Design an enzyme around this catalytic site. Structure first.
Site, PDB file in Angstrom:
ATOM      1  N   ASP A 139       0.841  -1.181   0.000  1.00  0.00           N
ATOM      2  CA  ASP A 139       0.000   0.000   0.000  1.00  0.00           C
ATOM      3  C   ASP A 139       0.885   1.241   0.000  1.00  0.00           C
ATOM      4  O   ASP A 139       0.569   2.253   0.641  1.00  0.00           O
ATOM      5  CB  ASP A 139      -0.929  -0.026   1.228  1.00  0.00           C
ATOM      6  N   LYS A 142       1.741   2.313  -6.415  1.00  0.00           N
ATOM      7  CA  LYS A 142       1.375   1.347  -7.448  1.00  0.00           C
ATOM      8  C   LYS A 142       2.539   0.850  -8.310  1.00  0.00           C
ATOM      9  O   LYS A 142       2.644  -0.353  -8.589  1.00  0.00           O
ATOM     10  CB  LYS A 142       0.224   1.884  -8.316  1.00  0.00           C
ATOM     11  N   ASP A 167      -3.581  -3.165  -1.643  1.00  0.00           N
ATOM     12  CA  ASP A 167      -4.672  -2.191  -1.684  1.00  0.00           C
ATOM     13  C   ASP A 167      -4.657  -1.457  -3.034  1.00  0.00           C
ATOM     14  O   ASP A 167      -3.603  -1.355  -3.672  1.00  0.00           O
ATOM     15  CB  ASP A 167      -4.525  -1.204  -0.514  1.00  0.00           C
ATOM     16  N   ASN A 168      -5.815  -0.960  -3.472  1.00  0.00           N
ATOM     17  CA  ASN A 168      -5.896  -0.142  -4.692  1.00  0.00           C
ATOM     18  C   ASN A 168      -5.582  -0.892  -5.987  1.00  0.00           C
ATOM     19  O   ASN A 168      -5.027  -0.322  -6.937  1.00  0.00           O
ATOM     20  CB  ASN A 168      -4.982   1.090  -4.596  1.00  0.00           C
ATOM     21  N   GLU A 197     -11.472   4.384  -0.021  1.00  0.00           N
ATOM     22  CA  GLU A 197     -11.621   5.004   1.289  1.00  0.00           C
ATOM     23  C   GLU A 197     -12.415   6.309   1.243  1.00  0.00           C
ATOM     24  O   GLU A 197     -12.224   7.137   0.343  1.00  0.00           O
ATOM     25  CB  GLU A 197     -10.251   5.272   1.929  1.00  0.00           C
TER      26      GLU A 197
END
Ligand SMILES: Cc1cc(C(=O)N2CCN(C)CC2)sc1-c1cc(O)c2nc[nH]c(=O)c2c1
Ligand SMILES: Nc1ncnc2c1ncn2[C@@H]1O[C@H](CSCC[C@H](N)C(=O)O)[C@@H](O)[C@H]1O
Ligand SMILES: [Mg+2]
EC number: 2.1.1.6
Length: 214
Positions: A139, A142, A167-168, A197
Site C-alpha cells: 500500500d 502502485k 490495496d488499490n 476510502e
C-alpha cells in the site's frame, strides 16, 4: 501546518489514549468529514481485519505507513509477541506514524523502517533478523507493487502460504501487479471488491498467497 499534522492533532484531541479502535474512528471521521486522505479506510479495513484474524500472522510487513492508520488497524489485531514492520519513505510521515502508534499504545508491536521499500527490503534479514514473512500489506506506490514482490521472492522473504494483500488494485490501480500474480503459478489469488476510502468509487484488495517456487 500539513494535512497529516492536522490528522494527528485531531486524534490527540479526540481519541482515547491506548484505545486503537477510538484512534481508527477519529481518523476515519476527520477524513470523512474534513479532509480526504489515503488511509486504507474502514470498508477496506474491515476486509483486512477479517483476513488478519483468519491467518493470525506472527510477522507482518507493511509497505507504506503514511499516518499510521493501517499499522494501528493491523497491530491492534496481532497476538501477543507478534510484530509488524512498516516501511515509510517520507520522514514526516514516519514520525507522525510513530506518534499515532505511541498514542494507541501499540509502539511495542510496531517497528517503523525509514526509507524506500526497494532499499530496505534487502536489509530485513541482517538488520531485523527476519526469516520469512507471514503476511505483507502492499500500500505504498502502485509502480512498486510488482518490483517489490519480485524483490521479496528474491531476498527469500516469502514462504509457501505467505499472504500478500494489496490495496488499490482498482483505484488508482495496479494493472501489472494484478496481471502478474493472477498469471503466475506461484500465487493463489482472491479479489475482494470494496470501495475507495471515504468514498463510493469502486476499488478492491487482492489477496495473493505465495505457493512457493515453480
Ligand atoms: C491519492 C489518491 C487519489 C485517489 C482518487 O481517486 N481521488 C482522490 C481525491 N478525491 C477527492 C477524489 C478521488 S485514490 C488515491 C490513493 C489511495 C490509496 O488508498 C493509496 N494507497 C497508497 N498509496 C497511494 O498513492 C494511494 C493513493
Ligand atoms: N517505495 C516506497 N517505500 C516506502 N514507502 C513508500 C514508498 N512509496 C510510497 N511510500 C509511502 O507509502 C505511503 C502510501 S499511503 C499508505 C497508507 C497506509 N498504508 C494506511 O492505510 O494507513 C505514503 O506515505 C508514501 O510516502
Ligand atoms: Mg491505499
Amino acid at each position: 501546518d500539513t494535512k497529516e499534522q492536522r490528522i494527528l492533532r485531531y486524534v490527540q484531541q479526540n481519541a482515547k489514549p491506548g484505545d486503537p479502535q477510538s484512534v481508527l474512528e477519529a481518523i476515519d471521521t476527520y477524513c470523512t468529514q474534513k479532509e480526504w486522505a489515503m488511509n486504507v479506510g474502514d470498508a477496506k479495513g474491515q476486509i483486512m481485519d477479517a483476513v488478519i484474524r483468519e491467518y493470525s500472522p506472527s510477522l507482518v510487513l507493511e509497505l507504506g505507513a503514511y499516518c499510521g492508520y493501517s499499522a494501528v488497524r493491523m497491530a491492534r489485531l496481532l497476538q501477543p509477541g507478534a510484530r509488524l514492520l512498516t516501511m515509510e519513505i517520507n520522514p514526516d510521515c514516519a514520525a507522525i506514524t510513530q506518534q499515532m502508534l505511541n498514542f494507541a499504545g501499540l509502539q511495542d508491536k510496531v517497528t517503523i523502517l525509514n526509507g524506500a521499500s526497494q532499499d530496505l527490503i534487502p536489509q530485513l534479514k541482517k538488520k531485523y533478523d527476519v526469516d520469512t514473512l507471514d503476511m505483507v500489506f502492499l500500500d505504498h506506490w502502485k509502480d512498486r507493487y510488482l518490483p517489490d514482490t519480485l524483490l521479496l521472492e528474491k531476498c527469500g522473504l516469502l514462504r509457501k502460504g505467505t499472504v500478500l494483500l494489496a490495496d488499490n488494485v482498482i483505484v488508482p490501480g495496479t494493472p501489472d501487479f494484478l496481471a502478474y500474480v493472477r498469471g503466475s503459478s506461484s500465487f493463489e489469488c482472491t479479489h475482494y471488491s470494496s470501495y475507495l476510502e471515504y468514498m463510493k468509487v469502486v476499488d478492491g484488495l487482492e489477496k495473493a498467497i505465495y505457493q512457493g517456487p515453480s
